[PDB]
Each structure stands twice: as structure tokens, then as C-alpha cells.
């Protein structure tokens, strides 16, 4: 796409209508006759599938247009079918309207009173007056039937007139999801009862029952075959009689064209051959394999010639007529089946060649492979390698990519300083140009050019145009991707939106791999063991804006799944923090100054003072020392903006107050006025943890300052680790002789665990021998049952886990030969840089019990777990209790069990991503258009309102983190007050009215809540329902206001209460979700991506495949169903301990329940949707295309799926408004 080629016309909408035979014969450039694609000598046979007049073919000027192979769009021809045959798309429609009729009266077998009743009901649904029609039914000898029909017609016409005169529905109908739902229900009942008439009502004479054995053939019984022309004539007559009644069954918007619907649409009078351009032969060196579509058309042409010859033979004129009639009938049937094969490749009789429907049905079809997910240009892929010195908002482009990828920059009067030298450089001397796109659109190339001529061309970049018509445009240079540009980096699979960010590009000089900073590891869920990822290079300024501002790596700090952070340094920097900010960390003047300048180099803008400031030494005498705390403090002081105070923060870390000595207070972290006065930086402070120092810097100084802080913290911790190492060893894993003796003595108490547990489960005496045949017999009876063994697998597992815990507690962290922080293993495990307590337990104490789907190790039919163990070995050792540790090694049986467990884990890990992605795809296809409107109400693309207030408060979860952290807000009150600057946020905002009403409703509520919820008459709306939170200050939710009031009523403490509540309410006014947010997409990702980690099948029982929602809906109604949906879709997430924001569960439940029923997220729910292209692009493209074209559905191109298919801008976010320019002159 070129920005200098403007397009005026835009596709408003498209409508699915059947093409008619008469229309085809007028457009066609030629009709094709012979079933030979091309004769010998290489030329195409005139009149064949190829031709000069069906599009220029392989260096043959097209006859139809007169232009070459490139400049001929292709032209459409047609095949004159000798006889009309069934259209396999509409065979079920033709076979429902073939039955349900009287072949003599040529009406339906239903009484015309009912037929007219349904006609007027469907005409009322054409205009959206759904309830008016339900009263139309409330109207209750033959000459009075005409009066009844006239009364209903007058009623319908007058209701239509009132609705149109009331400004309620325009001339083009009112079609939406609900009216569509009722129309579908009405038509389905119409057809279900229309076949219920076995005997006609207009003239009560029976008719034969048409019986279809399979597609291409229909049989009558009193068996007998019926020609297709008979069916066409029969339904032609029926449609002629009932045109007024089918005019409202095959339409949804008012047929302003008033064109009669025939039965000719249901039959294939002509086949249409696409231009030759779309059936070009498969060329593979010498091999030429013609198209399967060409072969199918050749077959149909052969059948046409054969049946035409049989007809002619019959025309040139007993027994000879008998054989020729049998052969003519078989020619009819064969050409019918061949047409059915050319359209669909599964109805045929005869592996089979793909049909035109088969190019669309499933994945790899034209929808889910060339429309939804295309293959993009100006992009690259590679393998990622880590690289500090990359600013956490940058990506390191190799020189290969940096020379290949280009951007078209139009030359101005201000750019010829650098684009001229880019042209002088050439396509290889980075930075430089590879092409010059002139005023005339000609793409002058530079790849094969000399440097002398290149400079000569550069000297004419910014010349005036000597063309009267191109004076508007100017030349473009395709410059190499410079250091200022932006790149959309994505790593498949894209489980969430934050996995496709926008980075600023740094052109590294050396190697061919995308070099990326460590912080984004959790954001992409990436490693560096060969992970591959792709960089997309946008080509226009409007695209640069979104990755630079909306998807920019700075804008992505908090994941909307819970508002938590998913940035922060990962492994080395965390342990470097546990060490650098210790009490033992003292730094001389030279060391401290080098560490400070090693990361806050003020030659590009790392620090906000343009001259580094230092801090007074902590220890003056004997010589000037410092501390790592002071290092953090001066780093913060340098990076933080001036004319603003420092942070105040109180928090904790994961390292207790016992791992630092008696009376220590390092576990609690304290920042006071921008200085680190206590506590060690940890995973909790910087890392994937909420409310830490980096999170607080994000919330107070902005996201950009947090990004700069992350870069400087990474650089500092790296420069500190490259001057001081940190290593794990073999001594770290060891235990003292005390620890080993404790471990052995406790594990000796695991000798009789198994026998006692087994005797307990079978309910015998605890003091019974292992060889007692009664115990053996009872264990044997337990063996075959899968639940008696289930409780034999559960009690023993608990005992061995408890003994595991006893060993771990008594051994570590006491017995370990090397203690924290000397023990680098514990240092990196407690801190959170890697691993858990369970890992160091297995490494130092024991692996424990091996779990294979909740139970113990699978058993043989004999009663032996393994060949090494006796039948029903009454010992926890045989069950899967791995006492050995990865330090001392494990026995062969325990090795076998560990292999079992590891293989099981690998199997499930392979399953989880693939199994749980279908659910996310379902959700994302449904909720693709559910966004935030400008009423702060969330609704679909069409407009069917889903909720009125986002979550009930319209608070963005990416800005909800520090809204209820009142103590934090008060401590940093001055910094927040500076950041919001209410000086220019009051000249256009009302305060008094919203505050008054909030006070009034607060007082009214405190007057109430003695009684349960049903008796609580409102008399007073919540402020958000009445007042716009983004326009009236103080319009805040009930629970938030109540918690703020409780805080102000328990904490009576230069800041007053009124100014603090003013600041908090302004912060709430700025913590509202902006209009145009794809809340459906965000909800789908936030419910599907965390689901990767009861469980997923439970989700499938609630989202996809319909306590129980059905019972609570059938008894308590729709809102109880919504509450049950949210509760059950939450507590499964809770049991996995994933924080899931209820602004997602509420949106999901309110989209499911939008019809008052339990609409799951499968094709059944999707059927009730206004836009056709979404449903076609989802699945069952054939059924949805039939339903779209039989109703002449004119979808208005609002869904995200549809607007791509038709080439228009989306309806979420940046496209959710227009932009118009003011011009000075009149």
C-alpha cells in the first residue's frame, strides 16, 4: 500500500445474493464448448477452458481486454448447461420446498390461513417489531377467512406505519441479534410444522411422498425416479402461487428492489468458469499438472457433449428409443453428479478431488489461511540471543536484517540532509537506500548501480516536478531500518496481547540474531535455547504510531489478567541484588563512583540532571566507605526527575529475618524520601511481583521512568556481577554429619509407614505382619477396584508427604554445611531467582512420592509394582517413595519411577498448550468485537449492549493496581499531586454535583442495609449509573468509596482529609478504561492464557459445552445463572491460585447470557449473530454461507472478522473514530 495513492470509495457493506442465469450470459466474455484444455503445439484451443478471451494466458494477449498477462485482471466465462440441474448448496432448501406442497392445488399442504399468518409474522420481524407480532397471533365457513386475512394485513401495515412514523425503524429494516434469533426460531417452527401436513388443506387430496436416497437423486412412492425438470417446474408453480408468502421467508431487510424470488435460483442453469488467471497450471520445472478445477470442468463438458448427443439422436427420430432413453437418463444423472462434484467434493459417488467448497470449509481453506491469517511482507524471523546494553525498549537488529528491511520515507526540504547521504551510501553501506520511488510511481533501483551514478541521482532527489499532475506527490527513498524506527516483535504462539510488543531498533554491527533484553522474558515467555521469533517492520507513519505509543514496551508493564506486573529482571540480577544490597557490601570511593557511572552514563539521557550527583559516605572514619543501599539510592536519585520528591515505600521480601542473624530487620524493606534505608532488593522488589519498588516507581513517576529504572538496574547489577561473580558448587548441595544423621534417622521411620497405612485402609489391626495372608487377601481385593485402591493410594501418599516434610524441616536450613548467603543454592532459591524449596529439598533431602494422576505407581496384574518387589509389597518403598536425592543418586527402582513421572509430565506439557488453545480461539472469535463504547458501556460491533458499566465501575485493570493503596498514596502525596496537576484539570470538569449525589447516596445506604437485598428499594441510583465518571469528579463506585471512607475513618492524621480525598478521586477519574478498548479480546486472552497452567475440562463444561448452570437457570432465572457462571468460572481458577480479575469473568458471563439463556461458546451460540463474514470465517462455512445467501443477508461490516475480509479499517481502538482537518480559507 502506498500512502501517495489515495482511495476515495469504500465498501459500506456486501449482501449475499444468488446469481441468475440471465445475468451470467450478459457479462460473459465467452462460453466454452469443448472438454479439451489446450491442443498440441502449445497454443490453447479456442473455446476450451483456457482461451485468449478468458484472460491472457502464458504470453498471449487477452482477447477480451487487449492487455498483457500482468495487466489483464482476467474475465469470466460460462458453460451453457444443456439441462438445469440441482445446486448442491441449496439441496436441503429445494428438498424442503419440494415437499410440503400439494401437486394439484399448487399451494402448500398447509391451510392458507396459517401460511398468511406466518407471512405477516415474518414481515413484522423484517422491521424489528418483535412484540407486535406476538399480539398479531392474538386474533381469533370460508368467506370470513378473507376478512381475517384483511384484518391481519391492516394490523401489520398500520403497525409498520406507526413504527416508521415514530422514528423507530427506517426504510431498511431493523435487524439485530435478538430479532434474528426470533426470526430463525419462527422459520424453523414454520418448516417443522409445514411438513406436518400429510394431506393438503386447499384441496384435500393426498400426494406422493418424495423420498431422497442420496444427493443427485429423488424418488417418489405411492421407488419411481423423477426428472429434475419436473421438480423445477413443480416448485416454479408453487413459488408463483406463494410469492407473497416466500417473499418474507427468503428476506430480512425490506426488498426495496421488489424483485420476485423464483425457483430458478435453486437450479444450475449455467456453470461459471473463473478467469484463466485462477486456474493456471501447476508448473514445476518441466512438470505441468493442470488444475483440479480444470479437470472437473472438463468432466462436466464431456458429460454435456455426451448428453447433447443422446438428445440429438432422440431428436432425429421403440427398443432403440428404450436404450437411448436409459442412456439419456444416465447422462442426466452423471452430469448432475459431476456438477455436484465440481461444487462439493463429498456428496459424490465413487480420495476425491477437492471441490470449490473444499477450498473454504476448514483450516487451510481460503478463510482460516488466506484471509484471517495471511503471510506478510517486510518482515523477518530469527533466533533470539540475550543482550544487556539494550534499553529494555529496544531490539538489536543484525546487519543482515538492517540492510534488507526498508522503509519508504518521502523526501522533504528537511530530510535531504540524511536521505541524500543514504542514497550516496547505496544499498550495502549501512545506513542507506535500496530504491527510489519517483513522482511517477516508478521504482528506480539502486542494487545494481555505481556509487558515482548514485550520488548523481542523490543530487536530484528534491527537484520540482515538471508534471502538472504529480505536483502533489514527491519522491520516496526506501531507507534501511535506522536506529530511530520501531519494530513489532512477536513470538509465536501469541497466548496474550503482551506477547506482540513494539520495540525501538538498535542496529548492532556484528551477528545474525535478534538481540533482546532480559526483562521481556516473561512478557514473551521466551528462553534462549534456540527460541525463534519474528520482527514486523511497519511501512507508514500511522502504523509506527501504534507500536510506538499503544503497543510500546513501556505501555505494557502490567498484564490485564490481574493488573500484576510481568516485567522485572529474572535470574542473575536478582542474586546480584541479594548480595549488593547486603550489610556486608561496602564500596570505596573509586568502586562506588565507577558503579554509578557504569550504568547512569549521562551522555544519552540516563539521568535527569546532566551532571552526576553523589552521596556522602556512610562511614567517614577511618576512610570514606559506602554501601550498596547508597548505590541504589544514588541510582534512583539520578534517574528520578528533578523538582519532585523521592519515593516512600514499605514492603517485604521473601528472605525471612532468621536468614540474616538474630534481631535482624532486613526482611522488611523501607524506602524513605528516595533513599534505601533498610531491606534487601529481591525478586519481590524488582521482578514479577506487585507493589515492589519498580512497581511503585511505575505508579508514581510514570511507566517511562520505570522502564529507565529497569534498564539502569539491569546495567548496574550486570556491571557488578562482571566485577564480582556468583557461582553454585558441589559443597552447596551437601549436609553436615548432623544433617545426614537426622535424615537417616527420620527416613528409618519410613520403614513401617506402608504396612501401617495399608492396615489402616483395609481396617485391620495395626500390629499385623506383612506376611499375614488376610492382609494379602484384602490388598488383593483392593487391587482390582480402582477406588478402594484409590483410598489405598491417598492415605499412604499423605503419610509419605508428611515424612518428606519432616525430613525437609529437620534437615534444612539447619543441617546444610554451607548456610545462607554463602550457600549459593539456597541464595538463589529463597530469593526467587530460580527454583523453590522443593527443588533444594529434592537435591539435598529426597525426591519424595511420585504422583501418576493422583494415585501411586501403576501395578501389574500379578500384584507387583515392579519385578523387584514381592506381590503387594507392604512398604512405601515399592509404592513410589523415592528416598534418594539428586546429590547422592537414586536406586534403579526409584530411577524407574522418576522416569515414569517425568514422561507423564512431558506428555501433559505437550497436551496443555494444544488442548487449551481451542477454547481461547472460540472466545476470541466470539468476543472479537466486544469493546468499550463512549457511553462507557461495553457492546458488540453491531451494538447489542453487553454491559452498561465495565465491571460495574469502568476501572482499567492496568491502572487499578494502586487505587486502594491509600497509605502508599498518602506517603507519596506530593509526587502524585505533581503528576496529576489538578491546575488544568478543573477548568473543564464538574465536581460539586457528583460529590453532592455521592454524599447523598452514601448517607442513604448507611441509612439502609439492615434488611436483605430484595427489600432494599433503591430510590437512589449509584453515582456511576447517573453521572459519567470521566466527566464528573467524585462519581465513584460504592465499594471503593466505602473502603476509602473506612481508611479515612480509622487513620486520623501537610496533608488534610479533604485534599487527600480530592487527589484520590481525581486519580480514580484518571483510572477509567478509555473508550474503544478491545475488552472482549483482553478477556478472552486473560481467561485462556492462564488456563494453560476441575481444570481445563471444567472450563469446557462452562464456556464451550453448556452449582449447575442449567438447574439454577431453570429454577432461579438468568441473573442467578450469570452469578453461578462467574462463581464456577472463578473458583476453578482460584484452586490453581491464579488471580483473575472479575472485570473479565463478568464480561464473559454477560456475553454468554445476553439472550437470557445459557449460550455456550460453540457454533450454536454464534448462529445468533448479525455479521455473516464472522460466521463464515469461523467454521461450517458452507452452512453459514447458505443461510447468508438464502436470506439475502446484507451484513454491515462491523465485526473485526468482517472488516478484514472486505479490506476496511477495524472498529476497535484507533479506528473507533474519524479524523477531520480544519482548513483556514473559506
Amino acid at each position: 500500500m502506498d500512502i501517495s495513492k489515495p482511495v476515495g470509495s469504500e465498501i459500506t457493506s456486501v449482501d449475499f445474493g444468488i446469481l441468475t442465469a440471465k445475468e451470467i450470459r450478459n457479462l460473459s466474455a465467452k462460453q466454452i464448448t469443448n472438454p479439451t484444455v489446450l491442443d498440441n503445439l502449445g497454443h490453447p484451443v479456442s473455446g476450451g477452458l483456457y482461451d485468449l478471451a478468458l484472460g491472457a494466458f502464458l504470453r498471449n494477449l487477452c482477447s477480451t481486454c487487449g492487455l498483457d498477462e500482468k495487466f489483464c485482471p482476467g474475465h469470466q466465462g460460462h458453460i451453457e448447461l444443456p439441462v438445469p440441474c440441482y445446486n448442491p448448496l441449496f439441496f436441503n432448501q429445494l428438498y424442503i420446498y419440494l415437499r410440503a406442497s400439494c401437486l394439484f392445488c399448487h399451494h402448500f399442504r398447509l391451510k392458507s390461513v396459517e401460511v398468511h399468518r406466518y407471512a405477516c409474522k415474518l414481515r413484522l420481524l423484517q422491521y424489528g417489531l418483535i412484540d407486535e407480532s406476538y399480539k398479531l397471533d392474538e386474533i381469533t365457513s370460508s368467506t370470513l377467512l378473507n376478512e381475517l386475512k384483511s384484518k391481519r394485513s391492516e394490523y401489520v401495515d398500520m403497525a409498520i406505519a406507526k413504527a416508521l412514523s415514530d422514528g423507530r425503524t427506517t426504510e431498511r429494516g431493523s435487524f439485530t441479534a435478538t430479532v434474528n434469533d426470533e426470526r430463525k426460531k419462527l422459520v424453523h417452527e414454520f418448516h417443522k410444522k409445514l411438513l406436518s401436513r400429510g394431506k393438503c388443506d386447499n384441496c384435500g387430496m393426498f400426494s406422493p411422498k418424495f423420498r431422497k436416497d442420496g444427493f443427485t437423486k429423488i424418488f417418489e412412492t405411492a421407488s419411481t425416479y423423477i426428472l429434475s425438470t419436473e421438480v423445477k417446474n413443480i416448485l416454479d408453480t408453487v413459488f408463483r402461487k406463494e410469492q407473497c408468502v416466500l417473499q418474507y421467508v427468503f428476506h430480512s431487510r425490506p426488498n426495496l428492489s421488489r424483485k420476485l424470488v423464483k425457483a430458478d435460483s435453486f437450479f444450475m442453469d449455467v456453470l461459471v468458469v473463473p478467469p484463466t488467471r485462477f486456474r493456471l497450471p501447476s508448473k514445476l520445472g518441466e512438470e505441468v499438472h493442470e488444475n483440479s478445477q480444470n479437470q472437473l470442468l472438463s468432466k462436466v463438458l464431456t458429460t454435456s457433449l455426451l448428453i447433447r448427443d443422446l438428445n440429438d439422436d432422440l431428436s432425429k427420430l421403440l427398443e432403440d428409443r428404450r436404450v437411448i432413453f436409459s442412456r439419456l437418463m444416465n447422462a442426466f444423472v452423471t452430469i448432475q453428479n459431476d456438477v455436484n462434484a465440481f461444487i462439493d467434493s463429498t456428496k459424490a459417488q465413487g480420495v476425491p478431488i477437492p471441490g470449490v467448497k473444499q477450498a473454504l470449509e476448514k483450516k487451510e481453506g481460503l478463510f482460516r489461511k488466506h484471509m484471517m491469517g495471511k503471510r506478510v511482507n517486510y518482515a523477518a524471523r530469527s533466533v533470539i540471543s540475550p543482550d544487556p546494553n539494550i534499553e529494555t525498549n529496544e531490539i538489536g537488529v543484525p546487519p543482515v536484517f538492517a540492510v534488507k528491511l526498508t522503509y519508504p520515507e518521502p523526501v522533504t526540504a528537511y530530510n535531504i540532509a540524511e536521505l541524500r547521504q543514504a542514497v550516496i551510501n547505496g544499498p550495502d553501506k549501512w545506513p542507506g537506500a535500496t530504491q527510489i520511488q519517483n513522482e511517477d510511481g516508478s521504482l528506480v533501483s539502486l542494487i545494481g548501480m555505481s556509487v558515482e551514478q548514485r550520488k548523481a541521482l542523490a543530487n536530484q532527489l528534491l527537484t520540482p516536478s515538471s508534471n502538472v499532475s504529480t505536483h502533489t506527490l514527491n519522491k520516496k527513498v526506501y531507507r534501511h531500518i535506522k536506529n530511530r524506527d520501531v519494530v513489532l516483535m512477536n513470538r509465536q504462539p501469541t497466548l496474550h496481547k503482551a506477547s506482540m510488543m513494539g520495540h525501538k531498533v538498535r542496529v548492532l554491527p556484528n551477528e545474525k540474531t535478534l538481540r533482546l533484553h532480559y526483562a521481556n522474558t516473561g512478557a514473551y515467555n521466551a528462553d534462549f535455547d534456540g527460541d525463534e521469533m519474528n520482527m514486523h517492520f511497519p511501512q507508514n507513519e500511522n502504523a509506527r504510531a501504534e507500536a510506538l505509543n499503544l503497543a510500546n514496551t513501556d505501555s505494557q508493564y502490567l498484564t490485564p489478567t490481574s493488573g500484576s506486573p510481568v516485567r522485572g529482571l529474572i535470574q542473575d540480577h536478582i542474586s546480584a541484588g541479594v548480595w549488593l544490597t547486603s550489610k556486608d557490601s561496602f564500596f570505596t570511593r573509586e568502586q562506588y563512583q565507577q558503579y554509578i557511572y557504569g550504568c547512569i552514563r549521562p551522555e544519552d539521557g540516563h539521568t535527569t540532571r546532566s551532571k552526576i550527583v553523589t552521596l556522602p559516605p556512610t562511614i567517614f572514619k577511618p576512610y570514606p566507605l559506602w554501601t550498596g543501599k547508597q548505590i541504589i539510592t544514588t541510582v534512583l536519585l539520578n534517574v528520578t526527575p528533578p523538582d519532585m520528591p523521592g519515593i516512600n515505600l514499605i514492603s517485604k521480601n521473601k528472605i525471612k529475618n532468621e536468614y540474616w542473624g538474630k534481631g535482624s530487620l532486613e526482611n522488611e524493606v523501607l524506602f524513605k524520601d528516595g533513599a534505601l534505608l533498610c531491606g534487601i532488593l529481591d525478586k519481590s522488589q524488582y521482578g514479577a511481583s506487585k507493589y515492589g519498588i519498580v512497581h511503585s516507581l511505575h505508579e508514581v513517576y510514570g511507566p517511562e521512568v520505570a522502564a529507565k529504572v529497569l534498564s539502569v538496574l539491569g546495567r548496574l547489577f550486570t556491571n557488578y556481577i562482571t566485577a564480582t561473580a556468583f557461582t553454585c558448587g558441589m559443597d552447596d548441595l551437601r549436609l553436615t554429619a548432623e544433617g545426614n544423621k537426622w535424615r537417616t534417622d527420620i527416613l528409618k521411620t519410613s520403614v513401617d509407614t506402608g504396612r501401617e497405612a495399608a492396615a489402616e485402609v483395609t481396617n485391620l489391626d495395626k500390629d499385623t505382619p506383612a506376611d499375614d495372608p488376610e492382609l494379602l487377601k484384602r490388598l488383593q481385593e483392593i487391587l482390582r477396584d480402582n477406588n478402594k485402591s484409590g483410598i489405598l493410594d491417598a492415605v499412604t501418599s499423605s503419610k509419605v508427604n508428611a515424612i518428606t516434610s519432616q525430613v525437609v524441616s529437620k534437615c534444612v536450613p539447619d543441617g546444610t554445611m554451607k548456610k545462607f548467603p554463602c550457600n549459593s543454592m539456597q541464595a538463589m532459591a529463597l530469593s526467587g531467582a530460580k527454583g523453590s524449596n522443593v527443588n533444594v529439598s529434592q537435591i539435598m533431602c529426597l525426591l519424595g512420592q511420585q504422583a501418576l494422576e493422583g494415585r501411586r505407581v501403576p501395578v501389574m496384574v500379578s500384584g507387583k509394582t515392579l519385578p523387584s518387589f514381592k506381590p503387594y509389597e507392604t512398604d512405601a518403598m515399592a509404592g513410589g517413595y523415592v528416598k534418594g536425592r539428586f546429590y547422592s543418586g537414586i536406586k534403579p527402582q526409584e530411577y524407574y519411577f522418576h522416569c515414569m513421572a517425568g514422561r507423564e509430565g512431558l506428555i501433559d506439557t505437550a497436551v496443555k498448550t494444544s488442548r487449551s488453545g481451542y477454547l481461547q480461539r472460540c472466545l476470541t472469535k466470539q468476543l472479537e468485537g466486544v469493546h468499550v463504547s463512549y457511553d462507557n458501556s461495553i457492546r458488540d460491533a453491531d451494538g447489542t449492549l453487553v454491559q452498561f458499566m465495565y465491571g460495574g465501575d469502568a476501572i482499567d485493570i492496568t491502572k487499578e493496581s494502586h487505587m486502594t493503596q491509600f497509605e502508599f498514596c498518602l506517603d507519596n502525596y506530593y509526587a502524585l499531586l505533581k503528576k496529576y496537576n489538578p491546575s488544568a484539570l478543573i477548568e473543564h470538569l464538574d465536581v460539586e454535583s457528583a460529590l453532592k449525589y455521592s454524599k447523598k447516596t452514601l448517607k442513604y445506604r448507611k441509612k439502609h442495609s439492615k434488611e436483605p437485598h430484595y427489600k432494599q428499594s433503591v430510590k437512589y441510583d449509584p453515582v456511576l449509573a447517573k453521572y459519567n465518571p470521566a466527566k464528573y469528579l467524585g462519581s465513584v463506585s460504592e465499594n471503593f468509596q466505602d473502603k476509602l471512607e473506612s481508611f479515612l475513618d480509622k487513620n486520623s492524621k501537610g496533608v488534610n482529609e479533604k485534599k487527600f480525598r480530592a487527589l484520590m478521586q481525581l486519580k480514580y477519574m484518571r483510572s477509567l478504561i478509555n473508550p474503544g478498548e478491545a475488552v472482549g479480546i483482553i478477556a478472552s486472552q486473560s481467561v485462556g492464557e492462564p488456563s494453560t497452567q476441575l481444570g481445563i475440562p471444567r472450563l469446557r463444561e462452562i464456556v464451550m459445552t453448556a452449582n449447575d448452570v442449567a438447574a439454577v437457570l431453570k429454577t432461579y432465572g438468568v441473573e442467578a445463572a450469570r452469578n453461578t457462571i462467574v462463581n464456577e468460572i472463578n473458583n476453578v481458577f482460584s484452586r490453581y491460585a491464579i488471580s483473575v480479575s472479575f472485570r473479565h469473568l463478568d464480561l464473559i458471563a454477560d456475553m454468554m447470557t445476553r439472550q437470557g439463556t445459557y449460550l455456550a461458546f460453540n457454533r450454536q451460540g454464534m448462529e445468533t449473530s448479525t455479521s455473516s463474514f464472522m460466521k463464515m470465517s469461523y467454521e461450517t462455512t458452507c452452512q453459514f454461507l447458505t443461510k447468508a445467501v438464502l436470506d439475502n443477508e446484507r451484513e454491515q461490516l462491523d465485526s473485526p472478522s468482517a472488516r478484514i475480509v472486505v479490506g476496511k479499517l477495524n472498529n476497535v481502538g484507533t479506528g473507533s473514530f474519524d479524523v477531520l482537518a480544519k482548513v483556514p480559507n473559506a
Binding site: 495513492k5 476515495g8 499532475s469
Partner: peptide, 18 residues
């Protein structure tokens, strides 16, 4: 030549000729 940059997309006559 004769593109959206240089030719009107749609040129109608407001009324009958005068």
C-alpha cells in the same frame, strides 16, 4: 494519469443545464 489525485471521484450535475 487520471487518478484520484488528479480527477474527481464522482462529478455530478447539481441541476439541469442553465
Amino acid at each position: 494519469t487520471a487518478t484520484t489525485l488528479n480527477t474527481p471521484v464522482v462529478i455530478h450535475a447539481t441541476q439541469l443545464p442553465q
